[PDB]
């Protein structure tokens, strides 16, 4: 019987053991993100803190953000600004081995995007250039093609060293809303009970979800009724209609079928037409055989 | 486990007695080392009726090498490769011990 | 400075059903049992209680006792578009009550 | 299966174990003796002794 149809597994399904997003990250790592805080907030000032990193250099920071290039001379010179929609790419850094003191631009999340650890973090691209900021909504996001990215500048915390005296800013972070999803890691420690961005939600950790493989049974067990009442099969004449199938409740013709394939060939070779592939566990998982670890070096 | 070959609780049996009458029992014309019960396993053993390095009774091991293979009266040997299948007793039996 | 220690032993078996043959001469040759020539039906009581001592732990279990028989069938077609079958099982029969 | 001339008949044990008593002592060897059990009309195979 050649059955066709559409199978659907729930969200329970997950046919791998790791995570598919930010696997090399520390599980404690938090993303570059922001949170509003009310400690010295309140009124027309609200402390919006930032935890993050700005990884790639520029040559200046103006109010157009990082200037990541310069236009070659043609009787003119103008600094090329980095696009807010996808530049500063978070995969681009430096190839020294880490530097400090120059101009640097990075990215961050808003406090309207709830924190989740950087270990399962995913947000779908909303642009073809790898941008992933949400579109602005005035009442509809469909015709609005302005993306939500707001610059935030920073500078060394001296008052006689830069800023107030000796004007300039040293870092810029392209802060955006994004569709932050962890679709394969579950939070396993958190210290608060808030899901909203906070200072203490940088400390959340997440381990991956359980591997859960779902497939059809071994020889398509239970995909046909055997040994049944009212669901029993018919093979009979077309005139006489004398059924030559008598099914008994106290008979098992699916177990019987399994045992027959160990009367016939090897059962350790898989077949795909009839979907054969015997259930077998790893025997070193079944019986744990410790032997320590060879580790004298 | 019912509809597939999978099973995994065969070690949780202690004894089966196939009673016929309460002055004798099925094979029980004196045949086994305990003629009134098939002991699958012993919890404590004064007589030494275990077989090496697990709980299984010598009687039970004899019966299950003559049920699956026909060896016991010519002394135990490792079954042949075609006599020993994935559901056959010998290759699923796993003694173990620890302190 | 190794501590005093007892031993513990067990075995596992997975994918095996515990087989006990029936009739005479424990070596498994043939399949037929000649108890039809001992009496045709003359039974009374003489027990037949299988009693399995089992290990308990927590939530429910089921026991599966396979009673091994013949499930022979002859399928004969005597004419085009005609098929019949006769079914026989003898120690546990499937017919004779409304038949 | 053959129905006759292989039947246990009277029916007697399938297994024996042979017994403890005393020996002559030795420091590095353990000396064991048996005098076997006997009954009636069976043939022992020495591959099935241990």
């Amino acid at each position: 019987f050649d059955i066709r149809g559409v199978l659907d597994r729930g969200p329970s399904f997950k046919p791998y053991s790791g995570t598919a997003y930010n696997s090399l990250a520390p599980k404690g790592a938090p993303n570059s993100s922001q949170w509003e805080q009310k400690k010295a907030g309140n009124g027309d000032t609200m402390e919006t803190h930032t935890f993050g990193v700005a990884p790639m250099g520029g040559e200046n920071i103006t109010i157009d953000g990082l200037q990541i290039g310069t236009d070659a001379t043609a009787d003119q010179d103008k600094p090329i600004y980095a696009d807010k929609t996808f530049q500063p790419e978070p995969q681009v850094g430096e190839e020294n081995w880490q530097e400090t003191e120059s101009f640097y631009g990075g990215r961050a999340l808003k406090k309207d995007t709830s924190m989740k650890p950087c270990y399962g973090s995913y947000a779908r691209p909303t642009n073809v250039k790898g941008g992933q900021a949400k579109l602005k909504v005035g009442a509809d996001g469909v015709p609005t093609k302005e993306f939500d990215i707001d610059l935030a500048f920073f500078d060394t915390p001296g008052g006689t060293v830069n800023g107030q005296d000796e004007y300039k800013a040293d870092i810029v972070m392209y802060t955006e809303n994004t569709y932050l999803e962890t679709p394969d890691t579950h939070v396993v420690y958190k210290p608060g009970k808030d899901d909203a961005s906070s200072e203490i939600n940088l400390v959340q950790q997440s381990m991956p979800n359980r591997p859960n493989y779902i497939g059809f049974r071994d020889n398509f067990i239970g995909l046909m009724y055997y040994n049944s009442t009212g669901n029993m099969g018919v093979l009979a004449g077309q005139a006489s209609q004398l059924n030559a199938v008598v099914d008994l409740q106290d008979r098992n013709t699916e177990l019987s079928y399994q045992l027959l394939l160990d009367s016939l060939g090897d059962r350790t070779r898989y077949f795909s037409m009839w979907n054969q592939a015997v259930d077998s566990y790893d025997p070193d998982v079944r019986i744990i055989e410790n032997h320590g670890v060879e580790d004298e070096l | 486990p019912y509809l597939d070959g999978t099973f995994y609780l065969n070690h949780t049996f202690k004894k089966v007695s196939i009673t016929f009458d309460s002055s004798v029992s099925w094979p029980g014309n004196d045949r086994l080392l305990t003629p009134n019960e098939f002991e699958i396993k012993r919890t404590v053993d004064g007589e030494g009726y275990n077989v090496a390095q697990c709980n299984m009774t010598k009687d039970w091991f004899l019966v299950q090498m003559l049920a699956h293979y026909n060896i016991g009266y010519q002394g135990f040997y490792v079954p042949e490769g075609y006599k020993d299948r994935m559901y056959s007793f010998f290759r699923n039996f796993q003694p173990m011990s620890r302190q | 400075s190794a501590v005093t220690s007892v031993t513990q032993k067990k075995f596992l078996c997975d994918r095996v059903m515990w087989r006990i043959p029936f009739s005479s001469n424990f070596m498994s040759m043939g399949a037929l049992t000649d108890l039809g020539q001992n009496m045709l039906y003359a039974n009374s009581a003489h027990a037949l209680d299988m009693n399995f001592e089992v290990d308990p732990m927590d939530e429910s279990t089921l026991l599966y006792v396979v009673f091994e028989v013949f499930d022979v069938v002859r399928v004969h077609q005597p004419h085009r578009g005609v098929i019949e079958a006769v079914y026989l099982r003898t120690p546990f029969s499937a017919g004779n009550a409304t038949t | 299966a053959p129905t006759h001339d292989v039947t246990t008949d009277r029916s007697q044990r399938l297994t024996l174990r042979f017994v403890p008593v005393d020996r002559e002592d030795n420091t590095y060897s353990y000396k064991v003796r048996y005098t076997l059990a006997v009954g009636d009309n069976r043939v022992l195979d020495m591959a099935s002794t241990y």
Binding site: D262, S263, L264, G265 | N70, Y82, R85 | M29 | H4, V6
Partner: peptide, 21 residues
């Protein structure tokens, strides 16, 4: 071989027969 089922010989032990005394 690829067999998982004994034969029966289909004959009992000893063809050869002795007289009643």
């Amino acid at each position: 071989d690829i067999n998982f089922s004994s034969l029966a010989p289909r004959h009992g032990t000893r063809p050869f027969m002795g007289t009643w005394s």
